[PDB]
Design a binder for this molecule. Structure first.
Ligand SMILES: Nc1ncnc2c1ncn2[C@@H]1O[C@H](COP(=O)(O)OP(=O)(O)O)[C@@H](O)[C@H]1O
Ligand SMILES: Nc1ncnc2c1ncn2[C@@H]1O[C@H](COP(=O)(O)OP(=O)(O)O)[C@@H](O)[C@H]1O
Ligand code: BEF
Ligand code: BEF
Ligand code: BEF
Ligand SMILES: [K+]
Ligand SMILES: [K+]
Ligand SMILES: [K+]
Ligand SMILES: [Mg+2]
Ligand SMILES: [Mg+2]
Lengths: 379, 524, 524, 137
């Protein structure tokens, strides 16, 4: 079947807002090991707004973090209508919470209860080496390539705003080729249109997509309307958490819709999804299945998870009862237990803000160290 | 998902209905008196076209089996476009005629295999008959006539294409881009040039034209980035000891070397110019090697263990003149050895074959033309964008037709060559009766294009076809003048390759499409 | 998605219905008696407008075929607005009339291609006839009359534009901007001015205007960013002994350097001011070189190989006065050589004719006007926002019409020039009967605008058109006063460029739309 | 969520209908001359099985009360599978017969608890009788 996945670059206002929220979270976590963070960001033309509820014993000024973060993308000029230093950032964050002494008492951290009700999902397939759906993975790699080239200085007239669309066809459930590649990017006005598409296809499209998957039927689309000079926060409204589907899987996996950016690890809306991906990746790397998903359910005010379900699409080499048995006795699905074994309480959420929360080997939740043990047990 | 299965005559009727819908959509644009088709596009204004392939690429139907038939027929036009560039409407008409007659024969109670074998045998004989009928096309008059006929009887574009082809030659590239004026203009480039200009505005010694001209200069080729002058002290001092200028072709030179270069040029010690290396990636090194071969010099690459410090006059090429402006750099009359030129063009020509994308074929053909030959561009002119697209499509069709006619030859146009072939193949026979029936089907359906051409003019196709069959040789019918005469004398020429490809693809698709027994598709 | 295909008369009827809907929406705003059209806007309040292109840009129908017809017609108005900036309703009316008569002829049984050829031939003859009829427009009275006519008969805006064009000169820039008061205001700038102000608020010495006022100062031009004071000592000491002030133009100066400059200005050692270099990129350097040429100085650039410590009093320019505000800086009576200025503007204009983009040219004419001439801003005054928008649109239309009239010339307005041209071509003939029919169609459709104007006035168009056609020369009908007379005497002037563009674009679109046979679009 | 409550004979007849559906599905695979049952699978090909537990694990009814009855009886087959490995169909047949006769007795106007006591006593005696009848193998 024909399926399309779309990815966006770091220069987009929503991605800018997501990067700001995660940058603050890392700064707060570095200063406060056990802080509570629930933040949101809004960006518009020349005005930047931040809000939410963050309860911590330390203080951080948001101005220097925002200027440092925005400068990283490359908004250091007024030509696109947004400059790092000329802009203004205001704070609308309540730094204190009434419940700081009433609930300070704790009985046992190992028996902490879930603060939200809902069910979360994971996903992993052996189609790619990174154990991820191909169309979303290659879409992220394309915009990642554009930023690396832009930062390298070989292509100085490129702009942070960029969007890519990749189309994949499946024959009998396997990848047989690439159909259409679209890369929408903003460029400077000095370079004409004809020279623009030549540089992008030969240095971004060519050395990223596999050569053996490209046939004569592949169609390359660059700048459909013909002029993408207009861009930045001026051309679109900016807010936090609107394309969670793009960040997680691109639509190939059912998702709960919970926002990721700007949330502390304490909330299960973010960390429990990370553990589900970690479990799903581990259970598929051992070769027990071709594809697998983990359905973990939690209830607000309830410690023990209500139900854990595993579905395989009939590709399992062992009965599903064995699959469920292994995850229960080898993975600690406790809301605090998964925190300790995934050691997420470190300032590592800045890089996760852009280019997808999943699909990178260096992430703690993307390790496959437990794959070998499960293969021996199920074998 | 669930599937729906239809057996026999029902599936055949649905398939024929889809084929008829697509063919009736396409057929209205055939001949000199055909009409245009408006294509709806959600992203902007509708596009009006007369191309058969453009109409066929857009048609799909609500019903599943009719959609099957339409999609199966679409490949005839698609392959005719990809192979020859013309004959898409003729191929579609021939395929429809084969399908109709073959379905009638199958409904008469005959097995499809024998009909398909007979059709294949008849087409195999017809290809050789067409090859026998062909005549070479060498003079510019015939090329102009072919270009005129291929562009809806537009003499200006045919004459322009003939003149451009004569100027460029046989080993060259002609391309069409949309212009800005109200009338078409032709621009030809002699020698080689690349879209790279001078780095700094202080190099121009002739401000009247805004371009710098170097007489008998050197050429220095480098692939490494330049930020310090220390690596060019020997070469610059050596060429300043001689006096005649030097040119630097590097991928990029930073401002530190620009400062010393410009101050040396201004102070009147050594006259140098700098241009960036054109292109990017492996193509950049390939064209750098091409420049090295043509200018009689040697490239300097760091990765091959060659350093610029040890370079001398033997590693620098020569040229008669060099003209550099804000956007282009031209090397005039290089002093390279010829056999290297033939070797390089042969290497690129043989590398063309293994390329799978026509974009790479275009790039390597452009490289061959740049290294040897000339390059010409045709800037079509129209007042409105829609007319711009229409004229551009017509000019591209004329270019393809002229190229094919030069490659293989021309035959009498108006659909009379196929009639002559069918009349000469009247004694073909097969193994059994059904093969003979298939041969008769093919021979009878070879007459479709002329009948459709006459029908588009509003006359009676039967009497015109009967009159044409009574003649011999190149006798035919002129649809523009509504009178008979010698097709060659009146200038109605058709390439042999286009007719052969259209016949082959139409027969190949229709023979398989006839044999269908049942269809399997998803439920609505 | 599944498509819908309609053939022949049904498609033509749907297309004509869409064309009629759009043309009826647009044509109610033609002439001096034309009324307004209100366009709904989702964000904000709807806008009262009288422009043909503004109304045409919004129309889109529910039915797919009529929508395609409307989208094809809309390009006439779009192109007419983009090319000349005026005369879009006339183009739409002409296109509708040509389409109607061509569809009638096609339904009568004629060949669409020959009709299109005849239309093109007639329009080609009409263009040269119009070029023959044109007369020059140079005096200020004719420019004022053109501006008055093009602005819905408003004397004040015409007089304002005439006097602004007289004051600025022949090569200048005039723009419109929202005003504050209830009356129009013209602001003309003398000298050179760039949109950049003082860096530090402590240079101000005249709080009466909140600005600095330097009398006969030196101008220091440095391309590089100034971050250390060490390079500043030599030229600062040199200018300290002279006693005259000094101004610094650099890309950016850090506050460490500003501190000592502010201290020196306070203590009265040197009267210095610092402003940023306007622009960014190559244009920044180009117009800073233009500043150096105007002021008679030399740019101290690191790229050329010249250092700031070695600067002397010869490298500093001079001017009569320099005024810097919070946002603007003006150089009054820059001392320089006239021949150098003429050479620079000659170089800039010869770059101008090589500009292939509209956006890349206006900056070039702005630079030309900045070096030689001046710029003007016209402020429109209105109590309410909607009235402000409508008045600004009318003023822009008048400005474009005056520019076109000065560029090419004027002809008698009111739609009588087209009538005279059509009366001159009464003997034009084609190659066959169909081309003659097309020529007659074009000639008869050339009289639509006058009939539409008279119909909008509320009279019988037929008798007025018959009376006008019975005269000769500039005889016409005055729609405002409802009386016949000499068009030039009454001051009803239309530029030749807008009439020619409207006719050409209307014919180019209508002739192509005539030859449609079938239309394919998505299902509802 | 809102609940539905049924009292007495209606609940009992719904339960018996569910039990009868499950038992009729299962018991056609008993003995040397019993036939097979085709079980549909969402991902893959249908499986043909003669097991009692395999058929019982897939029976889920539309009505809620009959579904409750079927789920209650499925425990017999599940426990017989997990305990000895055989005797699933025989256990299901015995459970259905006991349920039917006990429901008839209850509808006759008898105390269900004492019927449960009598059934337990009879089965306790029968286990000892079976132990006495056993022969070494
Ligand atoms: N003046 C003419 N008289 C008779 N036949 C013509 C004349 N001009 C063109 N033809 C024939 O009509 C055909 C035109 O086909 P065309 O509409 O270009 O579709 P395609 O070339 O895509 O198949 C040509 O094959 C040519 O032989
Ligand atoms: N007082 C007048 N008497 C007769 N004709 C006039 C008079 N004023 C304007 N006209 C004509 O009416 C036309 C006005 O067109 P207008 O409504 O401005 O639309 P557009 O300029 O966009 O075509 C002009 O072409 C002009 O020739
Ligand atoms: F319609 Be074909 F491409 F000439
Ligand atoms: F309607 Be036009 F722009 F005067
Ligand atoms: F029915 Be049992 F599994 F033999
Ligand atoms: K055609
Ligand atoms: K108007
Ligand atoms: K059994
Ligand atoms: Mg053709
Ligand atoms: Mg007007």
């Amino acid at each position: 079947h024909l399926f399309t996945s779309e990815s966006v670059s770091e220069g987009h206002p929503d991605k800018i807002a997501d990067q700001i929220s995660d940058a603050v979270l890392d700064a707060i976590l570095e200063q406060d090991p056990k802080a509570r963070v629930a933040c949101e960001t809004y960006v518009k033309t020349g005005m930047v707004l931040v809000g939410g509820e963050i309860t911590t014993s330390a203080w951080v000024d948001i101005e220097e973090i925002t200027r440092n973060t925005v400068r990283e993308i490359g908004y250091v000029h007024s030509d696109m209508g947004f400059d790092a230093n000329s802009c203004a950032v205001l704070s609308a964050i309540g730094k204190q919470s009434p419940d700081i002494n009433q609930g300070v008492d704790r009985a046992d951290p190992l028996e902490q209860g879930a603060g939200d009700q809902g069910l979360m999902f994971g996903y992993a397939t052996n189609e790619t080496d990174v154990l991820m759906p191909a169309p979303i993975t290659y879409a992220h790699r394309l915009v990642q390539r554009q930023a690396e080239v832009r930062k390298n200085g070989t292509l100085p007239w490129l702009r942070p705003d960029a969007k890519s669309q990749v189309t994949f066809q499946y024959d009998d459930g396997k990848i047989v080729g690439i159909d259409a590649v679209v890369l929408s990017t903003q460029h400077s006005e000095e370079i004409d249109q004809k020279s623009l598409q030549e540089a992008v296809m030969e240095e971004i499209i060519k050395p990223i997509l596999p050569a053996e998957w490209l046939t004569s039927a592949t169609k390359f689309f660059i700048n459909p309307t013909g002029r993408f000079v207009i861009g930045g926060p001026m051309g679109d409204c900016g807010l936090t958490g609107r394309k969670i589907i793009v960040d997680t899987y691109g639509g190939m996996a059912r998702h709960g819709g919970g926002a990721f950016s700007g949330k502390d690890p304490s909330k299960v809306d973010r960390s429990a999804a990370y553990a589900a991906r970690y479990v799903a990746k581990n259970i598929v790397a051992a070769g027990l299945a071709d594809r697998c998903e983990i359905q973990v359910s939690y209830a607000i005010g309830v410690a023990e998870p209500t139900s854990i379900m595993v579905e395989t699409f009939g590709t399992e080499k062992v009965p599903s009862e064995q699959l469920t048995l292994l995850v229960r006795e080898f993975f600690d699905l406790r809301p605090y237990g998964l925190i300790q074994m995934l050691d997420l309480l470190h300032p590592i959420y800045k890089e996760t803000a852009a280019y997808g929360h999943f699909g990178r080997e260096h992430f703690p939740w993307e390790k496959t160290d437990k794959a070998q043990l499960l293969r021996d047990a199920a074998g | 998902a669930a599937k729906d299965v239809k057996f026999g005559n029902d599936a055949r009727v649905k398939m024929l209905r889809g084929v008829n819908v697509l063919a009736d959509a396409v057929k209205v644009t055939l001949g000199p008196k055909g009409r245009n088709v408006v294509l709806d596009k959600s992203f902007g204004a509708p596009t009006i076209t007369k191309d058969g392939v453009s109409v066929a690429r857009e048609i799909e139907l609500e019903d599943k089996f009719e959609n099957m038939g339409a999609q199966m027929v679409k490949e005839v036009a698609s392959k005719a476009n990809d192979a020859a560039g013309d004959g898409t409407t003729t191929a579609t008409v021939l395929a429809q005629a084969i399908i109709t007659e073959g379905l009638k024969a199958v409904a008469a109670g005959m097995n499809p295999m024998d009909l398909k074998r007979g059709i294949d045998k008849a087409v195999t004989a017809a290809v050789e008959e067409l090859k026998a009928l062909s005549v070479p096309c060498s003079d510019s008059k015939a090329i102009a006539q072919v270009g005129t006929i291929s562009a809806n009887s537009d003499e200006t574009v045919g004459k322009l294409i003939a003149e451009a082809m004569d100027k460029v030659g046989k080993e060259g590239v002609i391309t069409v881009e949309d212009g800005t004026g109200l009338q078409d203009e032709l621009d030809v480039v002699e020698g080689m040039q690349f879209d790279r200009g001078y780095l700094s505005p202080y190099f121009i010694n002739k401000p009247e034209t805004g371009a710098v001209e170097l007489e008998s200069p050197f050429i220095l080729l480098a692939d490494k980035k330049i930020s310090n002058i220390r690596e060019m002290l020997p070469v610059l001092e050596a060429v300043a000891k001689a006096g005649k200028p030097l040119l630097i072709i590097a991928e990029d030179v930073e401002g530190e070397a620009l400062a010393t270069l410009v101050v040396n040029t201004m102070r009147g010690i050594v006259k140098v110019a700098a241009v960036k290396a054109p292109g990017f990636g492996d193509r950049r090194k390939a064209m750098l090697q091409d420049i090295a071969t043509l200018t009689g010099g040697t490239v300097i690459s760091e990765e091959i263990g060659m350093e610029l410090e040890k370079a001398t006059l033997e590693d620098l090429g020569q040229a008669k003149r060099v003209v550099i402006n804000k956007d282009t750099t031209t090397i005039i009359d290089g002093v390279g050895e010829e056999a290297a030129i033939q070797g390089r063009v042969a290497q690129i020509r043989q590398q063309i074959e293994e390329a799978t994308s026509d974009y790479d074929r275009e790039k390597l053909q452009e490289r061959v033309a740049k290294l040897a030959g000339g390059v010409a561009v045709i800037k079509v002119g129209a007042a409105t964008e829609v007319e711009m697209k229409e004229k551009k499509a017509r000019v591209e069709d004329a270019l393809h037709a002229t190229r094919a006619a030069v490659e293989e030859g021309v035959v009498a146009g108006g659909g009379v060559a196929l009639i002559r072939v069918a009349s000469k193949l009247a004694d073909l026979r097969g193994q059994n009766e059904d093969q003979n029936v298939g041969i008769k089907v093919a021979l009878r359906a070879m007459e479709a294009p002329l009948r459709q051409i006459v029908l588009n003019c509003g006359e009676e196709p039967s009497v015109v076809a009967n009159t044409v069959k009574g003649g011999d040789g190149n006798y035919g019918y002129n649809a523009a003048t509504e009178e008979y005469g010698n097709m060659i004398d009146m200038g109605i020429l058709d390439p042999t390759k286009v007719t052969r490809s259209a016949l082959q693809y139409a027969a190949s698709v229709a023979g398989l499409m006839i044999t269908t027994e049942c269809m399997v598709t998803d439920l609505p």
